[PDB]
Design a protein around this ligand. Structure first.
Ligand SMILES: */C=C\C(=O)Nc1cc(Nc2nccc(-c3cn(C)c4ccccc34)n2)c(OC)cc1N(C)CCN(C)C
Ligand SMILES: C=CC(=O)Nc1cc(Nc2nccc(-c3cn(C)c4ccccc34)n2)c(OC)cc1N(C)CCN(C)C
Ligand SMILES: C=CC(=O)Nc1cc(Nc2nccc(-c3cn(C)c4ccccc34)n2)c(OC)cc1N(C)CCN(C)C
Ligand SMILES: [Cl-]
Ligand SMILES: [Cl-]
Ligand SMILES: [Cl-]
Length: 289
């Protein structure tokens, strides 16, 4: 197995809590590696305590999968701290997650950034697939902006190997939001790369709507029926039909008829070459020839 860096609680401190959840608490903080002047801003994810021996065996699995992935569009682990409670330490992304980012800047985002982000997210998922990993929680909130030109996937807490037995530690946490999940996931607790492709669909939709809540104001109990009827999220205003066609293929009920991530890379790369053809945004200017 891998060798992970282990840090002393004294090497760093938690300034403030970026977020809170069933998973646990994640803080913003500062980290001075020993024998180094440099001060590094970090995110510190303090996990929830396990409530069973088997979950207590598994609570660190998250850190090992995160440490084993090496890809520019997937976030990495700096190390763990075990002193009292389990803490994963990662690089802070000061621009924050994409969901908030597109909300903060809905007036200022050009078509080229939106389509390049879709390419980057798909590349990272395609990497995870090559490694037999199923993320199970892809969402705009789980994509972080290192830079406008660089975005990364994250929240590996629910990630698992394809076909693996469900972990006892995953079951002791809160449930995934239904509104990003594929129908087969909802009905039978099946998860695959193709169920991740569905959540990519919703994620794209979130970005193209500049951060709207999927199925807003609807009860999660209705969602399974809606999907069975055949109803799907609407075409975002800025999207041409080519873009919406792609989202809609991601929500097809036969999982093996949805696109593969490698196909999404090709399609969205093509659009990102000529972005104003595929996304129509006011204030988006293409220079005259
Ligand atoms: C989508 C909300 C969000 O992440 N907001 C956010 C994030 C960051 N920076 C940052 N950098 C690395 C890791 C994380 C992070 C945060 N959470 C909750 C995580 C869970 C699992 C894995 C990684 C996680 N976050 C940031 O940098 C300062 C600011 C920020 N915002 C936008 C603060 C205000 N919002 C929370 C409303
Ligand atoms: C991670 C939590 C954990 O292991 N708790 C635990 C364990 C034992 N001893 C013990 N010995 C064998 C099995 C178990 C056990 C505990 N839980 C929750 C199980 C669930 C399924 C199957 C087995 C177990 N527990 C035990 O015997 C006195 C008591 C507790 N607690 C409830 C400790 C209190 N709290 C930390 C949960
Ligand atoms: C082998 C059966 C078993 O451990 N059942 C179990 C137990 C607990 N809670 C719990 N809490 C504290 C201790 C234990 C415990 C379980 N076993 C077997 C022990 C042996 C010695 C000492 C303590 C224990 N168990 C618990 O949650 C509170 C859940 C379960 N199960 C999931 C039922 C598993 N059963 C079908 C085998
Ligand atoms: Cl490249
Ligand atoms: Cl082309
Ligand atoms: Cl061409």
């Amino acid at each position: 197995q891998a060798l992970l860096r282990i840090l002393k609680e004294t090497e760093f401190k938690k300034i403030k809590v970026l977020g809170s959840g069933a998973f646990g608490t994640v803080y913003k903080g500062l980290w001075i590696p020993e024998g180094e002047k440099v001060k590094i801003p970090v995110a510190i994810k303090e996990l929830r305590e396990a409530t069973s021996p088997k979950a207590n065996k598994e609570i660190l699995d998250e850190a090992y999968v995160m440490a084993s992935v090496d890809n520019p569009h997937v976030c990495r682990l700096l190390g763990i701290c075990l002193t009292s409670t389990v803490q994963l330490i990662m690089q802070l992304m000061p621009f924050g997650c994409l969901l908030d980012y597109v909300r903060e800047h809905k007036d200022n985002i050009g078509s080229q950034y939106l389509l390049n982000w879709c390419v980057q997210i798909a590349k990272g998922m395609n990497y995870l697939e090559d490694r037999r990993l199923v993320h199970r929680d892809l969402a705009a909130r789980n994509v972080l902006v290192k830079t406008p030109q660089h975005v990364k996937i994250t929240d590996f807490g629910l990630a698992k190997l394809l076909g693996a037995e469900e972990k006892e530690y995953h079951a002791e946490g809160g449930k995934v939001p239904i509104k990003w999940m594929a129908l087969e996931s909802i009905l039978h607790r099946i998860y695959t790369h193709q169920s991740d492709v569905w959540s990519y669909g919703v994620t794209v939709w979130e970005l193209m709507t500049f951060g709207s809540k999927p199925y807003d104001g609807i009860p999660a109990s209705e969602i399974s029926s809606i999907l069975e009827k055949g109803e799907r999220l609407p075409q975002p205003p800025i999207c041409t039909i080519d873009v919406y066609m792609i989202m809609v293929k991601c929500w097809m009920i036969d999982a093996d008829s949805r696109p593969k991530f490698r196909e999404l890379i090709i399609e969205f790369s093509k659009m990102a070459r000529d972005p104003q053809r595929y996304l129509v945004i006011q204030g988006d200017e293409r220079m005259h020839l």
